[PDB]
Design a protein around this ligand. Sequence first.
Ligand SMILES: NC(=O)c1ccc[n+]([C@@H]2O[C@H](COP(=O)([O-])OP(=O)(O)OC[C@H]3O[C@@H](n4cnc5c(N)ncnc54)[C@H](OP(=O)(O)O)[C@@H]3O)[C@@H](O)[C@H]2O)c1
Ligand SMILES: O=C(O)CN1C(=O)c2c(c(C(=O)O)cc3ccccc23)S1(=O)=O
Ligand SMILES: O=C(O)CN1C(=O)c2c(c(C(=O)O)cc3ccccc23)S1(=O)=O
Ligand SMILES: O=C(O)CN1C(=O)c2c(c(C(=O)O)cc3ccccc23)S1(=O)=O
Length: 315
Amino acid sequence: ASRILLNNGAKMPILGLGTWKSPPGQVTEAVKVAIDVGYRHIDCAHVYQNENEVGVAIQEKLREQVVKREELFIVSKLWCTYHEKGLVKGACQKTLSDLKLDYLDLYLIHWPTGFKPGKEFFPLDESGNVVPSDTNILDTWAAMEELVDEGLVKAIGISNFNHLQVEMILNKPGLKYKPAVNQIECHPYLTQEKLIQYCQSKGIVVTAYSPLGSPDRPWAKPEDPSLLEDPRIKAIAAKHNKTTAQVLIRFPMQRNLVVIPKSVTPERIAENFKVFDFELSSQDMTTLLSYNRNWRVCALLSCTSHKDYPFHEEF
Ligand SMILES: NC(=O)c1ccc[n+]([C@@H]2O[C@H](COP(=O)([O-])OP(=O)(O)OC[C@H]3O[C@@H](n4cnc5c(N)ncnc54)[C@H](OP(=O)(O)O)[C@@H]3O)[C@@H](O)[C@H]2O)c1
Ligand SMILES: O=C(O)CN1C(=O)c2c(c(C(=O)O)cc3ccccc23)S1(=O)=O
Ligand SMILES: O=C(O)CN1C(=O)c2c(c(C(=O)O)cc3ccccc23)S1(=O)=O
Ligand SMILES: O=C(O)CN1C(=O)c2c(c(C(=O)O)cc3ccccc23)S1(=O)=O
């Protein structure tokens, strides 16, 4: 099966294309190529500042009848400065407008932390601390539920929520729609066994982000842990006649996760999709899980003083 059933009854492709740090002048071609080679899931966000260009690609392939809208699974995320109840619909509508869609398949709260609304995505006080919003995530969630009921989104979920935060939504008084997905960092150096087992046990599907360790993240050092260059992972890859990236993408698929590797390189977009013709053994899987070191590439460090900072909790 190339798709996983969500708790809203829809089927979500377990492989998608990520678009963080996809430059705007390259992402239209990247999404076009991805759709031509078989991808049906694109992961987007307003904060990435490239949704207009993603949308141009989607619209061209719809117009070309390469794909039907029904067959696509388009995901976007509500940024931190729009957690206020009265700003959620507008933010969604801006994303829809840019993507040139009339609905999203999934819309996520990007982070549990709300920030002061305004032009700035990371509003700072004069000492450099991020300025929080007093709007609690239960109220943001109610606003997300309204989007389902207005037909703008088919599913809602969360991202970078820890177990206590997931639990808070599942325990929300008068909860109407449960989160469909929790999108979190996951890779052999950050395997997330506790949080994944919890979410799956509640029927929330987990999407693994930065499955290659995000080597284009700002300031990445060669001397930092590198999944793509780990000789132990290379060794598994070679054993299977696959690339290290293909192993890194197949790994979460075999944990019943969704995975969203990013590329703007046509040959890599294509390579990255060639992950449905081999199987890692149970021993390969246990070996990859053993490389866990609790190493996080996306820790929102500028926001550790924020009330809802998610990564102080061990999971
Ligand atoms: N929810 C959130 O907070 C959150 C956080 C992080 C990520 N995400 C989503 O997850 C996606 C994936 O995470 P990520 O972008 O952080 O990093 P990633 O997918 O782990 O790594 C992307 C990097 O890997 C390179 N790459 C891709 N395929 C390769 C291959 N086959 N061989 C060698 N290098 C390859 C890409 O290079 P090129 O592009 O140059 O080919 C890019 O530099 C994001 O783009 C975003 O959609 C969401
Ligand atoms: O759900 C929709 O929006 C309509 N379609 C499906 O239900 C469906 C479709 C396809 C397909 O186009 O390839 C394959 C399906 C396979 C199994 C169940 C529903 C499948 S669909 O025509 O997109
Ligand atoms: O994504 C593809 O390349 C083709 N498929 C569909 O479009 C699709 C599929 C499924 C499924 O396999 O369960 C379910 C679908 C449900 C709704 C629309 C398209 C659905 S699919 O056969 O993977
Ligand atoms: O880029 C920003 O200004 C803010 N965020 C990041 O620092 C970040 C983000 C993502 C993502 O949301 O896809 C991925 C990151 C991967 C590695 C370091 C920082 C990553 S982000 O939430 O946009």
